[PDB]
């Protein structure tokens, strides 16, 4: 037997065992997420132990077969993937310690609760107690309370754990010959030896910052407009030259400004492009929402959900009896098993999210036939981009009219257009400076550029300088405000939410050309265009058998992030903002703060 014949035999063995074991583990994980009980946690922990041990041993075996002696590229790719050491480089004690730190941080975040200063017998959690305050409260003091209580009760707990987390993650990353843990995270975009399609880990920083430059003016004008309208809603609390207070941005961190639309809508007289009221008036429930999403995906030629999807998915909150992890998630268990977990509410946010998660599922179904390790998105941002282009078409007023959430006698005009673009900007454009700034702070911390005694110093400086947001209360180094967000204290890389946003508009531009769309890009809906569906499927079915650069170039004819489609999307709103801000100040001073 040749080296490659042995490799083929091994990979068939590994794939069979991997499928069966991964299916079993995902069943345990589903049980825990749908039903939070100690027994279910036990089973999931043991499943995870087995999974990681399996992958360690198979990676060790796959080390035998040298890549240079392998000529089959599909085989070579699987081998390349299976040969990465990962976290196995740490000692058993150190690896156990790091696992315990991650578990502790997760438990702290999920069980974290704050109690009212007076009558401290009744307390509030993040989900839902504090989240609804941050989303709907119009009281400066109540919002500030929720923001500061959450960051003090929970962040200060995570501060020492985060400190050790940095050391141990950096040790693992450097042991795998990465510069730091941030470099290890940037590895996701790396491409090697593909004859001009290569992409280096250092290149991602340059690309992110170069595109953020072009983002900066549109964000500045959106920011100035938002600041003006926030003064109308919190009188005496906002300076017309200052940063925005961090507790008045519509959620617990200002990650999205979506919830500000009601305070910032430019033309209230025109009919509401937020279709929540229409959905409620028409008595929509989660079944209706998901059937509508299924109908959308069929209209472009894609398969509708399997019977197993409608039998096994969890589309509503089970009740007070059993708790669940209500983070919207699209599950690909293998063996033709696809599910969605979403505690679905009758809102536009959940209508668009349903479309997004079903996009994840359509991606997964498309690449099901690939080998195990290749049944993945091309990079960490490809899946998010895939879901986001679905919601792009779903949010358009033309689409809402076609499904009846706008009246049949509804007419687009430049004002409703401005409303739509502003609401889009609040989510999409608002999240970019936030996401770039958070990931940059993490990257610098991992690189060692921010000493511990300056962590909360630097972070807030960056928040003022880049995001244009200012803390209402001064925060010393007892705090860990970044860790007060799920993704930071649960060890998720965050830059994907930046790269997603650029990919999405590139995909949308391309698909709309496939649908022969005439008009501005922001009027485009791909419904009923089996051509666009086909174009997107040709990339979806790839899995990650090809590097992300080539997979992108197959749909959009570009090998990299491009920011131009995003700007073209928002160009009319940019113009309108520039005119609306002609008397306002544009920019902000890092020196103004609420407390001083």
């Amino acid at each position: 037997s040749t080296i490659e014949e042995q490799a083929k035999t091994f990979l068939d063995k590994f794939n069979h065992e991997a499928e069966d074991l991964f299916y079993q583990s995902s069943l345990a994980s589903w049980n825990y997420n749908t039903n939070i009980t100690e027994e279910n946690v036990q089973n999931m922990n043991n499943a995870g132990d087995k999974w990681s041990a399996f992958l360690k041993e198979q990676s060790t075996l796959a080390q035998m077969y040298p890549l240079q002696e392998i000529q089959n590229l599909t085989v070579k790719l699987q081998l390349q993937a299976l040969q990465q050491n990962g976290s196995s480089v740490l000692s058993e004690d150190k690896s156990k310690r790091l696992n315990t730190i991650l578990n502790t941080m997760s438990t702290i975040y999920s069980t974290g609760k704050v109690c009212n200063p007076d009558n401290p017998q009744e307390c509030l959690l993040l989900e839902p107690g504090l989240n609804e305050i941050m989303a709907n409260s119009l009281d400066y003091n109540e919002r500030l309370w929720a923001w500061e209580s959450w960051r003090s009760e929970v962040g200060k707990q995570l501060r020492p754990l985060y400190e050790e987390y940095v050391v141990l993650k950096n040790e693992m990353a450097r042991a795998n010959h990465y510069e730091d843990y941030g470099d290890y995270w940037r590895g996701d975009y790396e491409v090697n030896g593909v004859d001009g399609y290569d992409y280096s880990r250092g290149q991602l920083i340059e690309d992110v910052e170069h595109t953020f430059e072009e983002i900066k003016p549109l964000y500045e004008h959106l920011h100035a407009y938002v600041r003006a309208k926030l003064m109308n809603a919190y009188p005496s609390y906002i300076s017309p030259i200052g940063c925005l207070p961090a507790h008045l941005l519509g959620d617990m961190w200002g990650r999205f400004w979506t919830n500000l639309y009601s305070l910032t809508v430019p033309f209230g007289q025109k009919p509401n492009i937020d279709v929540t009221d229409a959905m409620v008036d028409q008595a929509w429930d989660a079944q209706r929402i998901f059937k509508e999403a299924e109908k959308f995906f069929v209209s472009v030629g894609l398969p509708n959900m399997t019977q197993g999807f409608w039998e096994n998915s969890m589309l509503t909150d089970p009740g007070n009896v059993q708790k669940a992890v209500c983070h919207p998630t699209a599950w690909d268990l293998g063996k033709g098993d696809f599910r969605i977990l979403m505690c679905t509410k009758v809102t536009m946010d959940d209508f668009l999210t349903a479309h997004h998660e079903m996009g994840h599922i359509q991606y997964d179904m498309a690449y099901a036939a690939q080998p195990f390790l290749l049944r993945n998105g091309a990079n960490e941002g490809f899946h998010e981009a895939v879901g986001e282009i679905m919601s792009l078409s779903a949010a358009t007023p033309k689409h809402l009219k076609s499904i009846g959430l706008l009246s049949p006698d509804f007419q687009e005009d430049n004002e409703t257009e401005i409303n739509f673009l502003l609401k889009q900007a609040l989510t999409i454009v608002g999240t970019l400076p936030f996401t770039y700034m958070l990931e940059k702070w993490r990257w610098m911390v991992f690189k060692g550029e921010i000493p511990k005694d300056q962590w909360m110093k630097k972070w807030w400086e960056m928040k003022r300088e880049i995001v244009g947001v200012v803390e209402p209360v001064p925060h010393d180094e007892t705090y860990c405000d970044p860790a007060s967000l799920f993704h930071v204290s649960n060890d998720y890389s965050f830059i994907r939410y930046y790269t997603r946003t650029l990919y999405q508009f590139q995909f949308q531009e391309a698909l709309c050309q496939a649908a022969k769309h005439e008009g501005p890009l922001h009027k485009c809906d791909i419904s009923n265009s089996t051509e666009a569906g086909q174009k997107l499927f040709n990339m979806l079915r790839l899995g990650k058998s090809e590097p992300w650069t080539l997979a992108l170039e197959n749909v959009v004819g570009a090998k990299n992030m491009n920011v131009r489609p995003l700007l073209n999307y928002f160009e009319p709103l940019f113009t309108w903002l520039k005119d609306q801000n002609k008397n306002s100040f544009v920019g902000w001073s890092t020196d103004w703060s609420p407390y001083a």
Partner: peptide
């Protein structure tokens, strides 16, 4: 969350 990834087998839920 379990993952088809040798580098990142398990994500914290």
């Amino acid at each position: 969350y379990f993952q088809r990834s040798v580098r990142l087998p398990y994500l914290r839920c």
